[PDB]
Design a protein around this ligand. Structure first.
Ligand SMILES: [Zn+2]
Length: 117
């Protein structure tokens, strides 16, 4: 019994504490909604939560490899509403989280840049 539903939506109004981090989702942040059935209450059948772009993608890097979630940039209900510019930012996360395509094997890479305008 493995049923998992994921959706893509953008923040519209109000702030919500994202899961897996000490932050909140405010207008201007894109979040994915995961609808899973919880075997505990009868009224609360399936619940959905919003995540950040690094929190949801960071969980995949730590989650087990045998199971994969969210493949490519066209396997979720919501990316169509997003815009081409915003879609490019989401594709970069999967390319950095997956990497290794032809000749670029890299592991554990972090950079700290500070620019002011
Ligand atoms: Zn977060």
């Amino acid at each position: 019994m493995a049923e998992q539903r994921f959706c893509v939506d953008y923040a519209k109004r109000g702030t919500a504490g994202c899961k897996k981090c000490k932050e909140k989702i405010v207008k201007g942040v894109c979040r994915i909604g995961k609808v899973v059935p919880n075997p505990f209450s009868e009224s609360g059948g399936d619940m959905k939560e919003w995540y950040h772009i690094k929190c949801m993608f960071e969980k995949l890097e730590r989650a087990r490899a045998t199971t994969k979630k969210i493949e490519d940039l066209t396997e979720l209900e919501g990316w169509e509403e997003l815009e081409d510019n915003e879609k490019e930012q989401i594709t970069q996360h999967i390319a950095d989280l997956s990497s290794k395509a032809a000749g670029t094997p890299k592991k554990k890479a972090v950079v700290q840049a500070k620019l002011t305008t």
